[PDB]
Design an enzyme around this catalytic site. Sequence first.
Site, short mmCIF file in Angstrom:
data_model
loop_
_atom_site.label_atom_id
_atom_site.label_comp_id
_atom_site.label_asym_id
_atom_site.label_seq_id
_atom_site.Cartn_x
_atom_site.Cartn_y
_atom_site.Cartn_z
N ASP A 104 0.85 -1.17 0.00
CA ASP A 104 0.00 0.00 0.00
C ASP A 104 0.89 1.23 0.00
OD1 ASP A 104 -1.89 1.87 0.41
OD2 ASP A 104 -2.81 0.89 2.16
N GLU A 150 2.11 7.83 1.59
CA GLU A 150 2.07 6.57 2.31
C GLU A 150 3.11 5.60 1.78
OE1 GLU A 150 -1.72 4.62 1.91
OE2 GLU A 150 -1.31 3.21 3.52
MN LIG Z 1 -3.35 2.36 3.92
MN LIG Z 2 -3.13 3.39 0.78
#
Ligand SMILES: [Mn+2]
Ligand SMILES: [Mn+2]
Length: 371
Positions: free
Chosen positions: A155, A352
């Site tokens: 992610d 992120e």
């Molecule tokens: Mn996440």
């Molecule tokens: Mn994400």
Amino acid sequence: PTQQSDPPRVLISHLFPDGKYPAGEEVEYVNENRYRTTSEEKRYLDNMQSEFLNDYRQAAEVHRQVRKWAQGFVKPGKSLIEISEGIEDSVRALVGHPGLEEGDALKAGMGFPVGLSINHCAAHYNPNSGNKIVLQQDDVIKIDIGVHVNGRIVDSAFTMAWNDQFNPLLEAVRAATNAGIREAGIDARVGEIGGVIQEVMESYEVEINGKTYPVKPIRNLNGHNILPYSIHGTKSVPIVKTHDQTKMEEGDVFAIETFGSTGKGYVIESGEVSHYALRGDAPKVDLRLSSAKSLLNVIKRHFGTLPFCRRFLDRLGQEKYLLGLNNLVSNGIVEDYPPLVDEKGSYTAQFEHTILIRPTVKEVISRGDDY
Ligand SMILES: [Mn+2]
Ligand SMILES: [Mn+2]
């Protein structure tokens, strides 16, 4: 000689002919955990999971190559649909799994829907079929891409903008994410990481249309640990100071994400829903709608517990499923994830990375030369 194409279509294994994928940024743990780097015990333990690590690294390299294309392609005038489809087609080509036969998407491919969230929308927007939205010059878009190999989910997310007035907001959030990543490590307490993230982010302000706005962390959004085939575990990484004393532990995988906003620093659910996920803990239900029952089988056989979106159903030839999908949500079998928005007129940004808390070192597996 041997390079990725535009858009990416070259199988990732062709570009790494020994079958080993590059490690991300490897960082030694500090102080009382520094012994781990050279510990023969921890090195042997880390080596037991070589296949896990190599699958994770395959997913991260696919992520980097696809987002590199996206960073060169995404501009004002592109449609959200063509961006999302372009990302999805690239991921599936690179991992070698079209994701149309039952079980194939569960081997490798999209880890969750592509987040394409603009301005005051921070997260969880993806265009449904027929969407006609085109990016504008003054848009701030968060692109959240998930890639998995064998259920190892990377992610990682970044923000793009084209009007320089927004640059301080993007810089603030990138800096805050990097500060959170630096604080992460074995025995780090997540609420203390959140305080560091917040201090860095709040040191930034941005002038928009003549008015200066402090950058505020979005206090009700958080990072999380990542589990096999499951994007969210039980641990959270806040982005404000909290008294959560949960520690990072050997073997954890974390999505360290931060969000900053010029608005309230708080999001609510609002807008058309695109994102869903089958709950592993779904209760027993006497389903009566034939179409809820058939849809549940499609979901389980194609996505398992990976989040999906409406277009991921459409491409499987599903056309009459919204009644059944809403029924599975109402019965607690499928969770829905509506778009999350701060106040109208505000701007939000996100960065992120996925980090592996290995026995030896911390691995920022999704780090690239871009962010
Ligand atoms: Mn996440
Ligand atoms: Mn994400």
